[PDB]
Amino acid sequence: HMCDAFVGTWKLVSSENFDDYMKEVGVGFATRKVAGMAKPNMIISVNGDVITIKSESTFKNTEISFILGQEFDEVTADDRKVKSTITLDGGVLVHVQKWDGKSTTIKRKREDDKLVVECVMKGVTSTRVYERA
């Protein structure tokens, strides 16, 4: 029952500062423009120890399955090939991505009826708010 409150089908409703986060990560102009339009649906499920997050949109579909604390290979929506480790810290999913000698952290939190995704690269944060679909 570890991630119960995350499970479901979620739709992006709002974003703040996402262009600057993508700049900080190194995303090029064309991908920033088309990625910034997308309103993905994120489908989170759990089966035993395995968590799956599937995202579907216009622009790109992505899918990760993982065990908490166990590093895995990920392909991001901007097409980075990263090494990722996801843990639970005080009821927040904490996701670190390493690639090309860089690092970024994505936190996923339940806040009221919303799922809040906070993305940090060095000094720059972006907040992406999802609602139940």
Ligand X SMILES: COc1cccc(CCCC2=C(O)[C@@H](CCc3ccccc3)OC2=O)c1
Instruction: Identify which range of 1-9, 43-51, 65-73, 76-84 contacts ligand X by CB under 6 A.
Output: 76-84
DSSP letter for 59, please: S
Q: Check if the beta carbon of residue 30 is closer than 8 Å to that of residue 38.
A: no
Full DSSP string of 14-35: EEESHHHHHHHHT--HHHHHHH
H/E stretch holding 37 reads helix 29-37
Q: How far is the CB of 109 from ligand X (least distance, A)?
A: 13
Q: Residues 77-116 vs ligand X: string with x where CB under 6 A?
A: xx---------------------------x----------
Task: Please work out the total of residues on this chain that contact ligand X, with binding judged by CB under 6 A.
Answer: 19
Q: Measuring CA to CA, how many Å separate 68 from each of 31, 93, 97, 117, 122?
A: 30, 9, 14, 18, 24
Site for ligand X in 11-70 (CB under 6 A): 22, 25, 27, 35, 38, 40, 42, 55, 57, 59-60, 62
Q: Does 128 bind ligand X (CB under 6 A)?
A: yes
Quick one: CA dihedral 130, 57, 63, 23, positive or negative?
negative
Q: Which is nearer to ligand X, 1 or 75 (CB)?
A: 75
Q: Which residues bind ligand X (CB under 6 A)?
A: 22, 25, 27, 35, 38, 40, 42, 55, 57, 59-60, 62, 76-78, 106, 117, 119, 128
